[PDB]
Ligand binder design. Structure first.
Ligand SMILES: Nc1ncnc2c1ncn2[C@@H]1O[C@H](COP(=O)(O)OP(=O)(O)OP(=O)(O)O)[C@@H](O)[C@H]1O
Ligand SMILES: Nc1ncnc2c1ncn2[C@@H]1O[C@H](COP(=O)(O)OP(=O)(O)OP(=O)(O)O)[C@@H](O)[C@H]1O
Ligand SMILES: [Mg+2]
Ligand SMILES: [Mg+2]
Lengths: 96, 524, 524, 183
């Protein structure tokens, strides 16, 4: 088991959409890496300058739309890929 | 540039003199008693050859008009060589005989266009007569006889070629190359033998033989070149679970991937040998698809859609045995559906039909031989390089003649077939008297090969020609033994395609040349 | 360009005139009494040579047809030189004799193709007769006699070559090079002596000799070139702990690594000498593996998998002694398993068999000599440069003749062997009379070497030929002493391979030349 | 012997961009029965331009033939994969000719097949292309060398008008090669 530190999130990126909206199969760069993924683990929370730690607004098991970049790191646990990214890199959360 | 223009009989005489020079050079090499010709080469040693096409190619004369005639009648030997691969000396002999007798009629006031028409009519009827007079050449004995006759009465060459097509069947590909020893050798390889060695010496399972040997291995086929290991981790791991060895066909395996495969080859977790993909652009894909069909696998490619990471065991091909050396890789008894192999070879046959280049159809036939039947290499053995060239030319002539014999059948050799055809066409008539004179010059020229063979023997061409014409059927003259007998029973067979092509090309060019009245060339 | 075409007897006459010019130039160098030939060179001084191959190579005539004949018969000497290394003058003498007698039969109406067949049959039977008539040449005395006869009766050359073959044995490699002095010298080096000096002069343990000397040192072998020290702290520190010296074989050691090794060399903590890995791509790895096997070590490489940081003492090879100078590195009594050395030399032998290039097989033999047996260099001593070239040619002829003698045995020299073969083949018959005439011209031409030797002596070729044919066995004519006696007991031995190659190549090219009827060349 | 080879309708010499389009492997020829025809003046390499077109064609179910300056890379990969998967029968062949000629004969094909050419200069984009924009033909046969459209569903009056315009270009042309190409 892996859990983050401070304002960091462990997310499992969802599989890229093989087929398009109308049933057209997309391959190569067409099926680009998905920017939404379910949250696997939430850190303790962001640390403020005064010394208080506030919990992250994201929750474990909620799909989040995140941004790729230097902030996100692709680690491997049990031959599986997990993205470690700061909560700021999480643009949105997917509900319903 | 300033042109010299020659009209009428002066031009015809100069053209005929050039034709006579070229044909005299060529036709001293006709028959079993025909001699050799030395062709000086600007680079290297002179070439001693007996082919008519080589002598015809080398002939070029100082006089521009005689040279025009020489080039025009050299086209006969060139076309006969390109089409049938043999009968170039007979084609040149027939062409000059049609020209010499045609020009005699032209000098006698006959209309040369109607002479051309009569020659063409006689030759069309002659081609029909040859097609009727031919007999199938399917057994090995007739094939040996055809090869022997085409190799200047060399029985070993005929027997070797008969054995070669017996081993490689109808679909196999036979090629002739230089050999090291003093004896001809035959190397027949079946199934796939694409010339790509191991990418690293460390794959070698048997150091004494220096060859990687895999018993019932998997075969991975990737269209893309690979330099990293992560793409084939699922494939290699699943192969390790299977336990069977793995052979990799790819555009290029190198770097980290190659080092990893080598390390695991020593470690014994998986027996892996990686060799380069045979062929090149638009061809390597074809060979990879053929290998996949034979081995019951699927080619991993970007265009096809799948990736190496998702490749599975069912994706990987299977074969009974695999051997790899520094040069060639052989796959023995690839586990694949016979229907798929038959469909693929049928597709390659259609590509052969649609192909218009000799190299392309040769490559496609080689691929067919890789899939079905086999590939035979005849290594010519000779003491020197000049003897190597001469014997290789004779062996290639014999190979082409055997192929023509299986394609179109055989007829009596020694010029007997054309003698009989001319005998069967004595009742042929044209539209006017000029056309009948042309028919007669074609029929008379049909006796030129036999007369030239006999003259090369030193005997009397007229006597033997009359004696052969007096007979019937396959009765003719064995010039090697100087005795009369049945040509088929004596083993003197000419491919029907060779005779037909020689007659057709000789007739076409010769009629065109006898129709000429003016000749324009550059001033000397 | 415009061609001159010659037919029949005039073409044959011009061809024979060219063959006669070339053979007359070559054959004045046959025998012990044969003289020298001056070949004018476009660069440098003229070359004084007695080899028939050199004279044949230089001959080119003004007349195009005579030049064609000259080049065709020069092929005989070229092939005889390439195959056996000696007997080029005898091959040219045999070829012209077959040509002159063959052309006489062609002029007498005989069929040249059957003459060629008869000559080939006679020469095949002659090769069998020679193989039967040969005797093994294994003792040093017979080798000395063969070398002496092949060096134009130079006993010192024969004795030197016999000594070289005794010292380097069967697996050793003997080469001939220029020498400074006025006397021939023999330099034999055993074990490994690859020509790579120290990478830095400061490694020198013995300044008086200018040579690093390591007693029972470790040997590190790295395929990759190294410039940093960080890769070999474990190896160097463990060597220091052991205390034994270290020799580094690598693609390149330079910069910080070399400076560090030099610093520790003076500091005495380690006695390390670094020399470059011998050879280049695909060869450096092979001979590095050879050194590893000989010294019982393992090569450090990226492809093999291991790294220098993980190299240990067991990885490092061991040898009894190591000698380093500016030019060469010598390893004395490498501590390696004999089974591994024998297996590696067997693999190199397999590569020799599979190799098709002379350079490749000589390099592989050099590697074999490095592993097993030794390498000998014969430095030819001469006063000037012309003398050096002539003596080096004679010594190379003697080397090739001794090698052919050990390969295939020896026969009576001075043309006696071919005389005896011709006597034993007097009962040979062909298929017709033309073939029997060809057999007879081959048998008569088999006496040409002895007759030309005697003629070079100034004696009567016919008288001595008759006297030698009257005898039997090894009874022949010592031309140096001009006396009759046993050829073997007088020490006149010809390698059987030399005689067989001369006869075979002469026969092949000569038969092809006598089969010719037309000759096409460029206009003058 | 002399032979006569007569080909009617459109038979411009452009083969399939990928061998995998072949519906009939025995003849080595792609065969489409009553397919749509998309005509793009621009060369394409991505897929995002024709999801509307491809999805709407798949919804219709009729096959599709693509004429374009060049289809390559991800576009060919996507169309080929969809061809095996059977969602849409798509064959893409290069537009014939070169500059100032490819546009002319593409407009000719559009008129013959009752379609409209997709181009930047004309104004519309591939993303806004619809079925009515796409051309229609009775049959389409593709081989390695030639592409043939049989009985293109197009207005006769438009065809006669276009051939009249080509005749006027013939009259105004002054080069033998130009009038031969127009004929
Ligand atoms: N023993 C023989 N008796 C009679 N005719 C023979 C004999 N051997 C060969 N021939 C005939 O020789 C003719 C031609 O032989 P040859 O191979 O020299 O010429 P080619 O095939 O016309 O041309 P090329 O010089 O290109 O090989 C053939 O018609 C063949 O039947
Ligand atoms: N003392 C001798 N008495 C008789 N024959 C001798 C004597 N010495 C050498 N020969 C003979 O001389 C022949 C050829 O000698 P030579 O070395 O001149 O010619 P080669 O080996 O044919 O050619 P090359 O010029 O290339 O060395 C051999 O057959 C050899 O037996
Ligand atoms: Mg022939
Ligand atoms: Mg010699």
């Amino acid at each position: 088991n892996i859990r983050p530190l401070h304002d960091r999130v462990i997310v499992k990126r969802k599989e890229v959409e093989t087929k398009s909206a109308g049933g057209i199969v997309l391959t190569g760069s067409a099926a680009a890496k998905s920017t939404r993924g379910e949250v696997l683990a939430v850190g303790n929370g962001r640390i403020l300058e005064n010394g208080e730690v506030k919990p992250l607004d994201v929750k474990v098991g909620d799909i989040v739309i995140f941004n790729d970049g230097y902030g996100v790191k692709s680690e491997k646990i049990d031959n599986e890929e997990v993205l470690i990214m700061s909560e700021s890199d999480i643009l949105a959360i997917v509900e319903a | 540039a300033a042109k010299d223009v020659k009209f009428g009989n002066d031009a015809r005489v100069k053209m005929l003199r050039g034709v006579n020079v070229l044909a005299d050079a060529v036709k001293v090499t006709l028959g079993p008693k025909g001699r050799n010709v030395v062709l000086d080469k600007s680079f290297g040693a002179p070439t001693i050859t007996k082919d008519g096409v080589s002598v015809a190619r080398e002939i070029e004369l100082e006089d521009k008009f005689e040279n025009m005639g020489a080039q025009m009648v050299k086209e006969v030997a060139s076309k006969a060589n390109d089409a049938a691969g043999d009968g170039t000396t007979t084609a040149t002999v027939l062409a000059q005989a049609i020209i010499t007798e045609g020009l005699k009629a032209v000098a006698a006031g006959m209309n040369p266009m109607d002479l051309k028409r009569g020659i063409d009519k006689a030759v069309t009827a002659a081609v029909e007569e040859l097609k009727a007079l031919s007999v199938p050449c399917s057994d090995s004995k007739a094939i040996a006889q055809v090869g022997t006759i085409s190799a200047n009465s060399d029985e070993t060459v005929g027997k070797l070629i008969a054995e070669a097509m017996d081993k490689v069947g109808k679909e196999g590909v036979i090629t002739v190359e230089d050999g090291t020893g003093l004896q001809d050798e035959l190397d027949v390889v079946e199934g796939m033998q694409f010339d790509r060695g191991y990418l690293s010496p460390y794959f070698i399972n048997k150091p004494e033989t220096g060859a990687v040997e895999l018993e019932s291995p998997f075969i991975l086929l990737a269209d893309k070149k690979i330099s990293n290991i992560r793409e084939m981790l699922p494939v290699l791991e699943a192969v390790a679970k299977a336990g069977k060895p793995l052979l990799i066909i790819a555009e290029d395996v190198e770097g980290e991937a190659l080092a990893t495969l080598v390390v695991n080859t020593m470690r014994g977790i998986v027996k892996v040998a990686a060799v380069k993909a045979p062929g090149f652009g638009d061809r390597r894909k074809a060979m990879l698809q053929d290998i996949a069909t034979l081995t019951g696998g699927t080619v991993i490619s970007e265009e096809i859609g799948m990736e190496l990471e998702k490749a599975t065991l069912e994706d990987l091909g299977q074969a009974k045995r695999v051997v790899i050396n520094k040069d060639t890789t052989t796959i023995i008894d690839g586990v694949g559906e016979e229907a798929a192999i038959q469909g693929r070879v049928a597709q390659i046959r259609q590509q052969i039909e649609e192909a218009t280049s000799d190299y392309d159809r040769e490559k496609l036939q080689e691929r067919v031989a890789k899939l079905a039947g086999g590939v035979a290499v005849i290594k010519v053995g000779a003491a020197t390089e000049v003897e190597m060239k001469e014997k290789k030319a004779r062996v290639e002539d014999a190979l082409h003649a055997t192929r023509a014999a299986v394609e179109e059948g055989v007829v009596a050799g020694g010029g007997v077939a054309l003698i009989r055809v001319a005998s069967k066409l004595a009742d042929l008539r044209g539209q006017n008297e000029d056309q009948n004179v042309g028919i007669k010059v074609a029929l008379r020229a049909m006796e030129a090969p036999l007369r030239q063979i006999v003259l090369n023997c030193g005997e009397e061409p007229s006597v033997v020609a009359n004696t052969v014409k007096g007979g019937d059927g396959n009765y003719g003259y064995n010039a090697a033994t100087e005795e009369y007998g049945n040509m088929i029973d004596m083993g003197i067979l000419d491919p029907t395609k060779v005779t037909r092509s020689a007659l057709q090309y000789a007739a076409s060019v010769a009629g065109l040349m006898i129709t000429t009245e003016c000749m324009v060339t550059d001033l000397p």
